[PDB]
Structure formats: structure tokens, C-alpha cells
């Protein structure tokens, strides 16, 4: 996945480490990434690897009601996790579709 590592680096690593590159380029920093492929191909492996290498907090949002007490007692809308995401910025919010 050498090609995939480079692709995700310019989108998740470069905006975090070097925000000035995008400002000089005049483009908005990327914020959403989609990793698509057959199951077991390494999508979660690469997403976790980037968060580990850029020192970005890795948050996996499975929608589980077991972890809902940690997100917040409200639990009415999924954006309540942003409070924990802002506190641990830079953060990578990862969701995997079982399908």
C-alpha cells in the first residue's frame, strides 16, 4: 500500500504538519477521506497508522451504545463527540461500514 500511504499523507499529514503549503497553494485543507475496497485490505490498518505517525488522536465511531456513556449523557446527536475531538486535536475520526 505504498501508493495509498502517499495519498493519505498529502491529505491528513500535510494539512496538520504543514498548513502553510495549502495556504500558499490557495486550496482549502482536506477534511474527509474515503478508503474503499474489499474487506481485509488494510483500510483500518492505514487509517490507524496515519493517526499513529502524525500524533493525531484516533477515534473510532462505531455508533455503539456501549461507548455512549463516554461520548456524553445526552446522546441525542452524533456531533456531541466533537467536544472530545476538539480537546484532543489533531484528531482523526474513523468510521468503518460493515455493510
Amino acid at each position: 500500500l505504498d501508493k495509498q500511504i502517499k495519498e493519505i499523507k498529502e491529505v491528513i499529514e500535510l494539512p496538520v504538519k504543514h498548513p502553510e503549503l495549502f495556504e500558499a497553494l490557495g486550496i482549502a485543507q482536506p477534511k474527509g477521506v474515503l478508503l474503499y475496497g474489499p474487506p481485509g485490505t488494510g483500510k483500518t490498518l492505514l487509517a490507524r497508522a496515519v493517526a499513529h505517525h502524525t500524533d493525531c488522536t484516533f477515534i473510532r465511531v462505531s455508533g455503539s451504545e456501549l461507548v455512549q456513556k463516554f461520548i456524553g449523557e445526552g446522546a441525542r446527536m452524533v456531533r456531541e463527540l466533537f467536544v472530545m475531538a476538539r480537546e484532543h486535536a489533531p484528531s482523526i475520526i474513523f468510521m468503518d461500514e460493515i455493510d
Binding site: 500500500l1 477521506v33 478508503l35 474503499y36 475496497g37 474487506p39 485490505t41 492505514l46
Partner: protein
């Protein structure tokens, strides 16, 4: 799928013969392997397999 929502879409195709060898090399490092294992043949023996 609307442009501007997802800034980059990255494809993860099933590993080919060479990529399977790299994955085979990575995970076999966690085992007591006899010298001379031909992991290339084992990679060839797994067509269309995932990591």
C-alpha cells in the same frame, strides 16, 4: 459522492502477487520460521486473497 464533500477517495485493491508477498513477509516475521521458506510461491498460491 457529491464533489467537495469527500476531499480524496483512496482505493484499496486486493493485494497482487507482489503485494501479497510483502504482507506475507510482514506477518511471517512474528513466527519461528525455518530458513529458506519460499514465501513467493506461497503468495502465488493465494490468488485474489486479502491481507
Amino acid at each position: 459522492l457529491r464533489p467537495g464533500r469527500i476531499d480524496r477517495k483512496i482505493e484499496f485493491p486486493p493485494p497482487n502477487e507482489e503485494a501479497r508477498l510483502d504482507i506475507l513477509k510482514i506477518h511471517s516475521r512474528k513466527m519461528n520460521l525455518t530458513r529458506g521458506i519460499n514465501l513467493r510461491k506461497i503468495a502465488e498460491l493465494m490468488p485474489g486473497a486479502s491481507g
